[PDB]
Design a protein around this ligand. Structure first.
Ligand SMILES: CC(C)CN(C[C@@H](O)[C@H](Cc1ccccc1)NC(=O)O[C@H]1CO[C@H]2OCC[C@H]21)S(=O)(=O)c1ccc(CO)cc1
Lengths: 99, 99
């Protein structure tokens, strides 16, 4: 599809057997999802943006379906106000910016 | 152009007659630039990011050229970690997401 940017580019994702809403975010290097109790090992990470840093849990090789497009990669879990799909997964679904 | 996302979508912008580098950021509603001098009236505002809220100077109706494409709109200036071009200006240059 083609998504215009008049409104936030929110899409439905499937991760860990749950459906959620997330931003297709070209400004995020990596994917960050709202707190959720995922099984498996993780490592702590600090990620920074406007307002400072938050502590997150880095899970590797997580399967995520984004608008019916499957991807697998790093997913950071923490107290983010928004689910954001970052470039590490956007590249996997064939997403480009165009103007 | 069509921009892939294996690297950060960084582009050169012109604002206040000066060249800078900025990130095309579909996850940003607004455009936020690092501390700089800009002419004209500004009003204090607050904006929230992943890590909390920051004080910014809001400049309205500012000319800004993004990768050769002209826009006129609101630019927020403050202690952002990165110059981000947000949806208020991405829409003006006709930017869409595609996959
Ligand atoms: C700043 C940028 C370089 C990096 N960020 C992505 C941005 O898209 C961020 C997304 C966002 C955060 C919080 C609420 C809504 C959207 N948008 C944002 O701050 O937008 C500001 C300006 O416009 C307003 O609209 C929405 C908020 C206001 S990040 O989240 O900090 C981040 C940092 C490290 C990683 C791991 O690599 C992943 C993500």
């Amino acid at each position: 599809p083609q998504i215009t940017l008049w409104k936030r580019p929110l899409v439905t994702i499937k991760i860990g057997g749950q459906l959620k809403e997330a931003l297709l975010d070209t400004g995020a290097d990596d994917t960050v999802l709202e707190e959720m109790n995922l099984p498996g090992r993780w490592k702590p990470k600090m990620i920074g943006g406007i307002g400072g840093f938050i502590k997150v849990r880095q899970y590797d090789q997580i399967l995520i379906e984004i608008c019916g497009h499957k991807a697998i990669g790093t997913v950071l879990v923490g107290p983010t106000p928004v689910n954001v799909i970052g470039r590490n997964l956007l590249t996997q679904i064939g997403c480009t910016l165009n103007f």
